Amino acid sequence: GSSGSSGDNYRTTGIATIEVFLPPRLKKDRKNLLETRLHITGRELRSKIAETFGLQENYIKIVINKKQLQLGKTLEEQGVAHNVKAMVLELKQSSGPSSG
């Protein structure tokens, strides 16, 4: 429903290269780099990568520094700088409440 917000012309770009490491299942190409801002919420990432590689966002989890991506914290908050690395993990069987 309608699209188009914010603008720019001349101003430093708060972009940051991210290294996405897909599992030995998809295999698309060498180390995949993802260019994104830092202001974006960690959640946006988990979603970005997904959409990016058309993968799933509700079925994946980023990992950085043998830690988990803090979707509740901004890339900057958690501590995501430029030229960083990230791992793509696949959630486990999610049963939860039966579907009716």
UniProtKB/Swiss-Prot annotation:
This is NEDD8 ultimate buster 1. Induction: By TNF, IFNG/IFN-gamma and IFNB1/IFN-beta. Widely expressed with lowest expression in the pancreas for isoform 1 and in leukocytes, liver, prostate and skeletal muscle for isoform 2. Specific down-regulator of the NEDD8 conjugation system. Recruits NEDD8, UBD, and their conjugates to the proteasome for degradation. Isoform 1 promotes the degradation of NEDD8 more efficiently than isoform 2. It is found in: Nucleus. Directly interacts with NEDD8 and PSMD4/S5a, a member of the regulatory subunit of the 26S proteasome. Isoform 1 binds to NEDD8 more efficiently than isoform 2. Interacts with AIPL1. The interaction with UBD via UBA domains facilitates the linking of UBD-conjugated target protein to the proteasome complex and accelerates UBD degradation and that of its conjugates. Signal peptide: none annotated.
